[PDB]
Amino acid sequence: ARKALIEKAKRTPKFKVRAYTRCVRCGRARSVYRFFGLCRICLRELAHKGQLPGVRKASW
Amino acid sequence: ARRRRAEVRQLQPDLVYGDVLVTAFINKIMRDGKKNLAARIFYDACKIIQEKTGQEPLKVFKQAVENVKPRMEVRSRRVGGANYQVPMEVSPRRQQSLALRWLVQAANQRPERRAAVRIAHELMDAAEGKGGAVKKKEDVERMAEANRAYAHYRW
Amino acid sequence: EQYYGTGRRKEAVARVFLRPGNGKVTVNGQDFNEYFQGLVRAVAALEPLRAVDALGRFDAYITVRGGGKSGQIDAIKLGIARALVQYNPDYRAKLKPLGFLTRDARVVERKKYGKHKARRAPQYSKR
Amino acid sequence: ARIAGVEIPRNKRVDVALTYIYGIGKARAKEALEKTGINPATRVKDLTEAEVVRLREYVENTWKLEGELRAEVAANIKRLMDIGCYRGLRHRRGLPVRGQRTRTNARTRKGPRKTVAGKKKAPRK
Amino acid sequence: PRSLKKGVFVDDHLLEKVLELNAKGEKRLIKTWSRRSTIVPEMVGHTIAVYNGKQHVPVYITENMVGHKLGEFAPTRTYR
Amino acid sequence: KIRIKLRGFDHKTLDASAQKIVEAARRSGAQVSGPIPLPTRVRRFTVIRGPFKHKDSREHFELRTHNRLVDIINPNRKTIEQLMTLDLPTGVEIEIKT
Amino acid sequence: GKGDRRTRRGKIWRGTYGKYRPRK
RNA sequence: CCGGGCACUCUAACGGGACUGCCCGCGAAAGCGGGAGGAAGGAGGGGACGACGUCUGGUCAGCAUGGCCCUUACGGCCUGGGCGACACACGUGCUACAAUGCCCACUACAAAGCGAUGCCACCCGGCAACGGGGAGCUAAUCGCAAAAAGGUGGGCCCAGUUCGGAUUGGGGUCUGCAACCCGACCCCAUGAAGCCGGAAUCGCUAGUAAUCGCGGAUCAGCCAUGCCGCGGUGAAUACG
Ligand SMILES: [K+]
Ligand SMILES: [K+]
Ligand SMILES: [K+]
Ligand SMILES: [K+]
Ligand SMILES: [K+]
Ligand SMILES: [K+]
Ligand SMILES: [Mg+2]
Ligand SMILES: [Mg+2]
Ligand SMILES: [Mg+2]
Ligand SMILES: [Mg+2]
Ligand SMILES: [Mg+2]
Ligand SMILES: [Mg+2]
Ligand SMILES: [Mg+2]
Ligand SMILES: [Mg+2]
Ligand SMILES: [Mg+2]
Ligand SMILES: [Mg+2]
Ligand SMILES: [Mg+2]
Ligand SMILES: [Mg+2]
Ligand SMILES: [Mg+2]
Ligand SMILES: [Mg+2]
Ligand SMILES: [Mg+2]
Ligand SMILES: [Mg+2]
Ligand SMILES: [Mg+2]
Ligand SMILES: [Mg+2]
Ligand SMILES: [Mg+2]
Ligand SMILES: [Mg+2]
Ligand SMILES: [Mg+2]
Ligand SMILES: [Mg+2]
Ligand SMILES: [Mg+2]
Ligand SMILES: [Zn+2]
């Protein structure tokens, strides 16, 4: 997550397409789940801390 | 099977002849788990054993399986220097497993264009002492006995 | 008047109501050989009767939903066996051996990760 | 009997047979026997001289086939090349022409595999 | 089996720049960075230098070239 | 007859505070359609444990949304009293109609 | 088989619809 | 389908039950063998869970951080190209080489999930992709939807074929500012190699392998045959 790149936040991307998501917590581009705004890593860390409401360790 | 002795599986007897041996053969004929299509085949072929024979198919079937059972087979075993093909008795269960495996195998080597025909003719030809399967059974038996010189490696 | 045993198999539920009569079995409306037929298996679902020696004494209205036909074929094997228990309980002493009363726990094993199908593991070279 | 161009299908379903024609697929076949009331299932050799005519009449005039088609295709590719088109250059040296990877595969367009010497010191595995 | 739809695309940087060179002549050379623009009639005769990601290549345009994109004549990769 | 639907992540913050909106309606209104279950909407997240490669680890995470019904037959204006504003659930959301 | 773009299985496998696999 | 009713299925919440308790034998004991009852036994089946430590293991390009280095540029914006290059070589996979098969038609049983500028019923135009119109749905109440293999009927008749769909030509739909480089999709035409694979080598012990299709995450679209899941059908074999 280079800073000049966290420019993403741009309601004015110029073209809706260029509008890519990023991790709300790290800036991580890839594996950025939509239901959380977080990335694949952050999602696991926080879920472990209990800060993700409802989120639980699934087993079946 | 390092720990146990591995018990044998039991199979639901045939939905017709009410025989387990039949189901065994059915499963060997099976493929990709299509047990329905598999069952059909044995049955159609089972019918074709009649109107070609005045005998009951089951008696035919059960005696083919019999002539294909090998009473001796050669197994390997390294004894410093190389591997010696050692002949030895074949257990009652492997005989059956081998016999059936061989029938489906020879059957499918036949030229007859459709399955049921192939199983049928192989069943028959086998019943009277000829056919791919019996050939195999005899090549095997000939293998053993052809290595009597290594009989003292019992095991 | 009536008898009813449930019966389940591999995620299939079967309602089996046995009612004195000829012996014509129904399944979701369709005749027995109408919901099945073409399935050499089916015949076995009515084995519960044959064992106790029923058949010519009971008719059967059956409901079936969930999974696949061969599964249903087995759930029904319990219905006709559980309902056949409410009728005469001295029958349980004849289906115990046959095991028609035993529910079949065998079910699809979960698909694990790293693997391709729960157990089928991916292949490697090592060179 | 002989239809479209110097070709003659035979002893087998007219639809299947019409397939041996160049520009005639399996769809064009179903249509021709359709717009010509001929039963597709009939074995060519059992066709009426009247049917063969009504059949020939249609196919011949309604589509470009055999020598004709090849001359066109051959013609199009030639044009692509003649106009410095990228798609042309691919044809220029028989390499995939539809955005396909060429690091691996592309054997049908490249043909037999021409192996050479390489660096085995590095696990190219 | 190519496609675009019902509204053929062409970048207006030249769409009008090119047509203007017709309003009073024809001119010489042109420099574009839109290898994505379709080629249309009014371009024939002209000579446009398309960018191959590195330079501007002198692409002469002929009648039998309309419909194709400019990039198709400015190869990006240098090989053997 | 008031359609009630209780959703939540906790199977006690609902199942329980779903009897408060039933008992506080048993004696002030009809008999109520009692508390009705309703299947759950399990949303799974499968992610790679490690931060780099090792894609054969994973570890699973679910966020299951439980649901409840209730339904109070006879829009008893006398039931609307006990209810209205008297509960204890913090992790719940209600959707109700007539 | 599943690879034939112009067949039923061809469309099923490729998840699409069309002439060879109508949307009923 | 309506009245109607919650017995049944089911939905989701609590709880019951299995303990070698229960019977014969061996045993010093633990426990082992066998049976009875029971849906289930002896760890019933599958998960979550992985010690002290090891490999100067992997990641400073997720994030954090010491040191070091660049600070009209090793920072920044942008247009375009590249990550998609192709004489070659390997890994993992997909689809196959076919008759236990392929095709067309008709007919039947699933589970788990997703759905507001979203899933899209039904209707009309189009061979079709899709386009126009438009009902319902805050979704056990509507949609994705067909499950496929299967069953029934017909066709093909052993052929590189009605096997197999590569490659290439043409026309067109769609998402997106824009599909040349470099998208998927439909339709016509083309119709390749492949006849079951050398040495060598991988997986799997039961509802598993094998086989069949279904959903989702990311996502405008998609190069997913990948990945994480679901259920249908359902083996062989283990002396040792
Ligand atoms: K492995
Ligand atoms: K080739
Ligand atoms: K296949
Ligand atoms: K357990
Ligand atoms: K270390
Ligand atoms: K093989
Ligand atoms: Mg940083
Ligand atoms: Mg994007
Ligand atoms: Mg993103
Ligand atoms: Mg499965
Ligand atoms: Mg042709
Ligand atoms: Mg390329
Ligand atoms: Mg084909
Ligand atoms: Mg097909
Ligand atoms: Mg004891
Ligand atoms: Mg003793
Ligand atoms: Mg533990
Ligand atoms: Mg190191
Ligand atoms: Mg390193
Ligand atoms: Mg790359
Ligand atoms: Mg491979
Ligand atoms: Mg229409
Ligand atoms: Mg047929
Ligand atoms: Mg072909
Ligand atoms: Mg062949
Ligand atoms: Mg392997
Ligand atoms: Mg997607
Ligand atoms: Mg691609
Ligand atoms: Mg898929
Ligand atoms: Zn992050």
UniProtKB/Swiss-Prot annotation, chain B:
Belongs to the universal ribosomal protein uS7 family. One of the primary rRNA binding proteins, it binds directly to 3'-end of the 16S rRNA where it nucleates assembly of the head domain of the 30S subunit. Is located at the subunit interface close to the decoding center. Binds mRNA and the E site tRNA blocking its exit path in the ribosome. This blockage implies that this section of the ribosome must be able to move to release the deacetylated tRNA. The lineage of its organism: Bacteria, Thermotogati, Deinococcota, Deinococci, Thermales. This is Small ribosomal subunit protein uS7. HAMAP family: Ribosomal_uS7_B (MF_00480_B). Part of the 30S ribosomal subunit. Contacts proteins S9 and S11. Binds to the C-terminus of IF3 and to the C-terminus of Era. NCBIfam families: rpsG_bact. CDD domains: uS7_Bacteria. Pfam families: Ribosomal_S7 (PF00177). The keyword Ribosomal protein applies. Keywords: Ribonucleoprotein, Ribosomal protein, RNA-binding, rRNA-binding, tRNA-binding. It comes from Thermus thermophilus (strain ATCC 27634 / DSM 579 / HB8). GO terms for cellular component: small ribosomal subunit.
From Swiss-Prot, chain C:
Part of the top of the head of the 30S subunit. The C-terminal region penetrates the head emerging in the P-site where it contacts tRNA. Gene3D superfamilies: 3.30.230.10. Part of the 30S ribosomal subunit. Contacts proteins S7 and S10. The gene is rpsI. Pfam families: Ribosomal_S9. It comes from Thermus thermophilus (strain ATCC BAA-163 / DSM 7039 / HB27). One of its GO terms (molecular function) is tRNA binding. GO terms for biological process: translation. This is Small ribosomal subunit protein uS9. Keywords: Ribonucleoprotein, Ribosomal protein, RNA-binding, rRNA-binding, tRNA-binding. Signal peptide: none annotated. PANTHER family: RIBOSOMAL PROTEIN S9, SMALL RIBOSOMAL SUBUNIT PROTEIN US9M. InterPro entries: Ribosomal_Su5_D2-typ_SF (IPR020568), Ribosomal_uS9 (IPR000754), Ribosomal_uS9_bac/plastid (IPR023035), Ribosomal_uS9_CS (IPR020574), Ribsml_uS5_D2-typ_fold_subgr (IPR014721).
Curated annotation (Swiss-Prot), chain D:
Located at the top of the head of the 30S subunit, it contacts several helices of the 16S rRNA. In the 70S ribosome structure it contacts the 23S rRNA (bridge B1a) and protein L5 of the 50S subunit (bridge B1b), connecting the top of the two subunits; these bridges are in contact with the A site and P site tRNAs respectively and are implicated in movement during ribosome translocation. Separately contacts the tRNAs in the A and P sites. One of its GO terms (molecular function) is rRNA binding. Disulfide bonds: none annotated. Part of the 30S ribosomal subunit. Forms a loose heterodimer with protein S19. Forms two bridges to the 50S subunit in the 70S ribosome, contacting protein L5 and the 23S rRNA; these bridges are straddled by the 5S rRNA. NCBIfam families: uS13_bact (TIGR03631). The keyword rRNA processing does not apply. Residues 94-125 are annotated as: Disordered. Belongs to the universal ribosomal protein uS13 family. Keywords: Ribonucleoprotein, Ribosomal protein, RNA-binding, rRNA-binding, tRNA-binding. Gene3D superfamilies: 1.10.8.50, 30s ribosomal protein s13, domain 2. It holds the Pfam family Ribosomal_S13. One of its GO terms (cellular component) is cytosol. This is Small ribosomal subunit protein uS13. InterPro entries: Rbsml_uS13_C, Ribosomal_uS13, Ribosomal_uS13-like_H2TH, Ribosomal_uS13_bac-type, Ribosomal_uS13_CS. GO terms for biological process: translation.
UniProtKB/Swiss-Prot annotation, chain E:
Gene3D superfamilies: 30s Ribosomal Protein S19, Chain A. Located at the top of the head of the 30S subunit, extending towards the 50S subunit, which it may contact in the 70S complex. Contacts several RNA helices of the 16S rRNA. Part of the 30S ribosomal subunit. Forms a loose dimer with protein S13. It holds the Pfam family Ribosomal_S19. One of its GO terms (biological process) is ribosomal small subunit assembly. The keyword RNA-binding applies. Keywords: Ribonucleoprotein, Ribosomal protein, RNA-binding, rRNA-binding. SUPFAM superfamilies: Ribosomal protein S19. Signal peptide: none annotated. InterPro entries: Ribosomal_uS19 (IPR002222), Ribosomal_uS19_bac-type (IPR005732), Ribosomal_uS19_CS (IPR020934), Ribosomal_uS19_SF (IPR023575). It comes from Thermus thermophilus (strain ATCC 27634 / DSM 579 / HB8). HAMAP family: Ribosomal_uS19. Belongs to the universal ribosomal protein uS19 family. This is Small ribosomal subunit protein uS19. GO terms for cellular component: cytoplasm; small ribosomal subunit. GO terms for molecular function: rRNA binding; structural constituent of ribosome. The keyword Ribosomal protein applies.
